[PDB]
Write a protein that binds this ligand. Structure first.
Ligand SMILES: *[C@@H]1O[C@H](CO)[C@@H](O)[C@H](O)[C@H]1NC(C)=O
Lengths: 385, 108, 123, 279, 49, 97, 49
């Protein structure tokens, strides 16, 4: 069930200031009245984050996932219902889906077929996907639910694990501090690069209530967190914001007395890795071996030695006609890297039924009487019609 | 093609004896045989599969040994409920699932 | 403990056709292969036919090719074997063997069997 | 482990196990389970530790490819099919299965990816069947020259040598962490003893000390508790949810006051920094 | 500080590993801690002078 | 030991214990012929089911498998002390200087 | 100085060696450098006194 909406209003996204939100408990241990420095994917302080309004405003774009997502929602009446993650956003590649209806929460990773305008509509009308072919995980739990609702979520994807952190608050972004406790972990193990939110429409045409949602991106950096006596996070200092914050981070203190201090040096982070080698000349003579007009008999198998040249095994490796790639003692993909003293090429002609006989541990007329291969044979065999 | 032979056909024993039966294979087939107890009055049963891998649910008195062509089954107890015929069947050769000739075993 | 019921036998004129049905209820039928084997009244076992867990790989005996066919209904957990072009050498007993693995031609052996049904082909 | 049919290595199967008691002697006493080798945990100890969540990754590979299932190990299956992260704790159980996955005519139910544009991330499953591109000209859905099918079928046959026999592999990965553990090893509980020097074992956390009632308020998800020295000083009783404080048992220094042994051999003993009503 | 060992707690190393390589891990931990103590003692000696 | 241990009917001259009471300490031997406790009910000298005899017989035959062939194995344990070693190598002896 | 490792170049250790023992080699190099810097600092402290 796909319904297209033509009431969208085109407008560049708004921009606002992140202030000092976006801190989450790195681990599940308990620490009290101690300062701890941790390096991870955190939302930079005072970052310029994207701001979307919904009212006749409708902001449902597709946003890059990057290394993580911080999703805040200023909401009343809970008009925002879920999330969608994926790369191709169709049944070609598996995609992840979260919804939170009036009863429970639904989590599904499947090769869904999403409609171009996925939304919801009392609420008894759900139009987000048309077909689901292959699924890999499901989970059902309890529902999560003047503007009075503030929801802060952190989505991370590390090592086949999808981490979701949540925080609920009763109330632009308010000036304050609030750490996010870890909510759920998911064993998804797929590729995620794009995402989008999911909205529900009020039907009486249709009008959307006033709501806003903010998007920020995570970056790998170090934060210095202060735990109070009760054991809850009350303050944090970015370690790469400004030189005062760098000094605070280095001295491991939140107050710095008068003086001069040393923090670090001047540094340019690397971007690419460059590899250089001389010109690849003196190729080994493979053409005379394979493109030879006439081969010798199997009993008088032609033997050729190859050395003192560069052996581009990809040429033989990348020809389809050569159907059978049976190699013993070495993987074909490391033929390009692994180097040997000498190569022996034994060329002959046999029948189709006796191809399997030239192998370790085999028996037959060819193996016993024409050409015998050792049990600990290190090399490949190639056969083609 | 594959040919299998069973040297024993009918054997005599008692309640407290130990007896062995062997099977021969024409060609080496990598010890992939199974051994069957066929009671004439009820359904026959699997006892050992593969070379010497005992099938669960049967007494461990029966013992299998040998690899390659010659395989040997041994009964150490010879309980009075072993009046049956013993079969050795191959599952490796190109002719699929060829069976052997019967081996009568009784006690006198 | 698995149970194998076989039915459909009787007396038939050579050259006719009939049905043998085998149903299993003691295990999960969807992931196990089955075979049909023959016990002669005066000769030992010899393989007849077999089908895998799903109807993809099928095989027949050398002297049997093109004569008998097998079918497998996973919906009600049963399999069928059709007697066609019967002669006087097909008056033996049939056993409904269960394979250990999933394919048809594997080193996997036969685990559990049941009481077969007696058929004879004569006037 | 008793599953009739395993999945392909490129689309390796994954199962989550949690909230149960796990006995590893069941796997240990079976003869066929030959390659039972574990990184980060000695096998003999699995009977005592407690884990949060465990994962079983099952697939089938070639016999010689088993050596490529290892952290920090490069390989065709490692690069394009299944790569183990370097910081991986857990075991691998590989055993020969020539009796089930080999067809005399030829088995073709298992496939492995051969070509990919980039190396796989740890615990990443790629099921793309797109025609691999090897040249500048686009494939455009045609598997012609320099356009190859990355999936290749393992043609397992019983007549092969040990080098190509199918091998069934199950990788057990442990989420060993400070999170509240639920996968529990076989062990018997014991009554709670308080206010004395005891040897305690809390969910595989060994220690020696005095267990007292504490006023710390753990977060409902927060299990353990540490200090400035990063050692577990506050803990939560798994059986009943209370907070216990751990204090090292009374120790101290002992010095001897003594005149020269030339004149006498009487001595006195000084216990440093302790009221000797607690000696 | 882990000093390059898999964990910074002796109890975890003992309860998680068998002696043959737990001894290597404990060797690493002991040598690191001994080096730290040596440094502290040397600094104390200089300050005392 | 195929050339020396090969009986066509299977050589029973070598026996091997299976159902020992527990794991044995290194460098110790047991010649116990008592019936092993193979269950909950005590054996009390009763054999058969629930009480299996640990001893079993090798079935070595001249044409068994390569791994199924009998192998003679001798282990030499060497202990070195400050005491004068009485079992030394074949190195010659010279005159001291 | 190789500090008893296979090679004295960090990048060569990281490149042609797998992580399982590359970690040990890196630990050896770094601990050697720490010990040398410690000796230099102690000498400087004594000279400062
Ligand atoms: C914890 O917070 C409460 C207020 O919620 C406060 O009254 C109490 O003093 C705090 N704990 C400590 C140890 O200060």
């Amino acid at each position: 069930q796909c319904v297209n909406l033509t009431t969208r209003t085109q407008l560049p996204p708004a921009y606002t200031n992140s202030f000092t939100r976006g801190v989450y408990y790195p681990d599940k241990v308990f620490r009290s009245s101690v300062l701890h420095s941790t390096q991870d994917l955190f939302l930079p302080f005072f970052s310029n984050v994207t701001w979307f309004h919904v009212i006749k405003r409708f902001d449902n774009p597709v946003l890059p996932f990057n290394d993580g997502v911080y999703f805040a929602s200023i909401e009343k009446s809970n008009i925002i219902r879920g999330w969608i993650f994926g790369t191709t956003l169709d049944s070609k590649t598996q995609s992840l889906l979260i919804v939170n209806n009036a009863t429970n929460v639904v989590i599904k990773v499947c090769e869904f077929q999403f409609c171009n305008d996925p939304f919801l509509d009392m609420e008894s009308e759900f139009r987000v996907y048309s077909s689901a072919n292959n699924c890999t995980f499901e989970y059902v739990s309890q529902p999560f639910l003047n503007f009075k609702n503030l929801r802060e979520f952190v989505f991370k994807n590390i090592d086949g694990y999808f981490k979701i952190y949540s925080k609920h608050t009763p109330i632009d972004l308010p000036q304050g501090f609030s750490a996010l406790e870890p909510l759920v972990d998911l064993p998804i193990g797929i590729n995620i690069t794009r995402f989008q939110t999911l909205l529900a429409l009020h039907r009486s045409g249709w009008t959307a209530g006033a709501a806003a949602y903010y998007v920020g991106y995570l970056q790998p950096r170090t934060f210095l967190l202060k735990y109070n006596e009760n054991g809850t996070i009350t303050d944090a200092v970015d370690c790469a914001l400004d030189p005062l914050s760098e000094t605070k981070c280095t001295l491991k203190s939140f107050t710095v007395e008068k003086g001069i201090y040393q923090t670090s040096n001047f540094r340019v982070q690397p971007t690419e890795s460059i590899v250089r080698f001389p010109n690849i000349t003196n190729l080994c003579p493979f053409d005379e071996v394979f493109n030879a007009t006439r081969f010798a008999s199997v009993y008088a198998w032609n033997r050729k030695r190859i050395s003192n040249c560069v052996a581009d095994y990809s040429v033989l490796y990348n020809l389809a006609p050569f159907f059978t790639f049976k190699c013993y003692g070495v993987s074909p993909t490391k033929l390009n890297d692994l180097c040997f003293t000498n190569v022996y090429a034994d060329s002959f002609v046999i029948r189709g039924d006796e191809v399997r006989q030239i192998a370790p541990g085999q028996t037959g007329n060819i193996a016993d009487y024409n050409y015998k291969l050792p049990d600990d044979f290190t090399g490949c065999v190639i056969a083609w019609n | 093609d594959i040919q299998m032979t069973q040297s024993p056909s009918s054997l005599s024993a008692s309640v407290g004896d130990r007896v062995t039966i062997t099977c021969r294979a024409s060609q080496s087939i990598s010890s992939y045989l199974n051994w069957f107890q066929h009671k004439p009055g009820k359904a026959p049963k699997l006892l050992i599969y593969g070379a010497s891998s005992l099938q669960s649910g049967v007494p461990s008195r029966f013992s299998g040994s040998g690899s390659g062509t010659d395989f040997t089954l041994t009964i150490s107890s010879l309980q009075p409920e072993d009046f049956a015929t013993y079969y050795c069947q191959q599952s490796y050769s190109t002719p699929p699932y060829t069976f052997g000739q019967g081996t009568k075993l009784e006690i006198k | 403990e698995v149970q194998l019921v076989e039915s459909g036998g009787g007396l038939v004129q050579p050259g006719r056709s009939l049905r043998l049905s085998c149903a299993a209820s003691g295990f999960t039928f969807d992931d196990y292969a089955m075979h049909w084997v023959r016990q002669a009244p005066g000769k030992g076992l010899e393989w007849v036919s077999g089908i895998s867990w799903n109807s993809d790989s099928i095989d027949y005996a050398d002297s049997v090719k093109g004569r008998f066919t097998i079918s497998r209904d996973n919906a009600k957990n049963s399999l069928y074997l059709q007697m066609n072009s019967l002669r006087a050498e097909d008056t033996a007993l049939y056993y409904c063997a269960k394979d250990r693995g999933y394919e048809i031609l594997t080193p996997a052996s036969f685990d559990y069997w049941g009481q077969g049904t007696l058929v004879t082909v004569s006037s | 482990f008793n599953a009739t049919r395993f999945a392909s290595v490129y689309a390796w199967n994954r199962k989550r196990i949690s909230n149960c008691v796990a006995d590893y002697s069941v796997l240990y006493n079976l003869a066929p389970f030959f390659t039972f080798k574990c990184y980060g945990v000695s096998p003999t100890k699995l009977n005592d530790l407690c884990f949060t969540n465990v994962y079983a990754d099952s697939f089938v590979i070639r016999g010689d490819e088993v050596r490529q299932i290892a952290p920090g190990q490069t390989g065709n299956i490692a690069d394009y099919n299944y790569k183990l992260p370097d910081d991986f704790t857990g075991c691998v159980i590989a055993w020969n299965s020539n009796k089930l996955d080999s067809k005399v005519s030829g088995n073709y139910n298992y496939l492995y990816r051969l070509f990919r544009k980039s190396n796989l991330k740890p615990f990443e499953r790629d099921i793309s069947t797109e025609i691999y591109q090897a040249g500048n000209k686009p494939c455009n859905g045609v598997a012609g020259f320099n356009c190859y099918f990355p999936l290749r079928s393992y043609s397992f046959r019983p007549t092969y040598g040990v080098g190509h026999q199918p091998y069934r592999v199950v990788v057990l990965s442990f989420e060993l962490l400070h999170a509240p553990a639920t996968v529990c090893g076989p062990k018997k509980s014991t009554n709670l003893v308080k206010n004395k020097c005891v040897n305690f074992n809390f969910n595989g956390l060994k220690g020696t000390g005095v267990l007292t009632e504490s006023n710390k308020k753990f977060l409902p998800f927060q299990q353990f508790g540490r200090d400035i020295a990063d050692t577990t000083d506050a803990v939560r009783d798994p059986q009943t949810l209370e907070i216990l404080d751990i204090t090292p048992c009374s120790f101290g220094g002992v010095s001897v006051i003594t005149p020269g042994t030339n004149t006498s051999n009487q001595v006195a003993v000084l216990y440093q920094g302790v009221n000797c009503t607690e000696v | 500080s882990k000093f390059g060992a898999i964990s910074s707690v002796l109890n975890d190393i003992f309860s998680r590993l068998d002696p043959p390589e737990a001894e290597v891990q404990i060797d690493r931990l002991i040598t690191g801690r001994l080096q730290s103590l040596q440094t502290y003692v040397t600094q104390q000696l200089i300050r005392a002078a």
